[PDB]
Design a binder for this molecule. Sequence first.
Ligand SMILES: Cn1cc(-c2ccc(=O)n(C)c2)c(COc2ccc(-c3ccc4ccccc4n3)cc2)n1
Ligand SMILES: [Mg+2]
Ligand SMILES: [Zn+2]
Length: 324
Amino acid sequence: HMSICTSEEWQGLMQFTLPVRLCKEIELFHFDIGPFENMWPGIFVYMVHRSCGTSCFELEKLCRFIMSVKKNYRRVPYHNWKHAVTVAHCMYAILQNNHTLFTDLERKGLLIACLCHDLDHRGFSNSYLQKFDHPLAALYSTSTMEQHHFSQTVSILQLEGHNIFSTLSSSEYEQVLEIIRKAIIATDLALYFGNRKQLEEMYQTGSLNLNNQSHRDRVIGLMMTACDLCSVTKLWPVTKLTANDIYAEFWAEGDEMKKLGIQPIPMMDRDKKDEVPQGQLGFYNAVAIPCYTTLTQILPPTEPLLKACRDNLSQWEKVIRGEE
Ligand SMILES: Cn1cc(-c2ccc(=O)n(C)c2)c(COc2ccc(-c3ccc4ccccc4n3)cc2)n1
Ligand SMILES: [Mg+2]
Ligand SMILES: [Zn+2]
């Protein structure tokens, strides 16, 4: 049932040399991949090599993997390849900026997870599939997409000469699949709330054991979430336009409800175009900010996110107050 790259593709990738003027930008957290799509797969390669060295993965096997992923990403408005790479740029950006803090076995699993975390998004929400009534919410009951996202990671690696992690002990290979599993689950934004709760507390008290493997996992979780929402931390006009990407998908899904004579929540309702900056603001305030705060908290390097998170918020304010 899976989908796979061709010789042409992965050898085309294998060939890629990133242009020197980009080595500078890509290191900034606010960096936006949008203009340079051609390079998108190439870029992820660059970042693996910068993080994990050109000797962490068999290059043939890697490019093969990157592109087959690329194929299991649907041509949807927002939950698409462009997204996976944007997110995975952010996890990188993070990991570089906290270099001593994560194992080799960690940077890998994550940078990978970040690429895979929405594999085969059909553009609808968990709520959409659960509350009626896909063969996906018939088999995965909770975090539907998020486990599919992973079982879709799972299968990909199980494809011919794709298994990038063949160079590890069944104990490390199993370890990293379990690093991924968790890390990809983390992206169920619902889960972030109980997750960030703890992380506020264990900071408040200050009983947060970086040695404790279950504590540990949680920081990742927020990390994921942080990267997942990162579109908010790009410069105003990048964020501006990405908002229409989420809105296309949202309303598209609300239109599907409407076609059964069901009122979709005003978020997915396109006939409420105007309430958006109002909504967006709430989200920044209730969700984004508390998120990037607790982060900058645990990982002070991550400050520029929160800095730029605010700058956008500020702008949405303006747009409401009548100044855009
Ligand atoms: C799980 N999740 C990740 C993201 C997200 C959000 C923004 C963003 O830039 N990214 C990258 C990701 C979201 C919803 O974000 C939104 C949050 C809220 C609205 C909203 C809410 C209420 C509205 C009411 C009326 C009109 C428009 C309204 N609009 C839109 C998007 N849910
Ligand atoms: Mg997701
Ligand atoms: Zn996502």
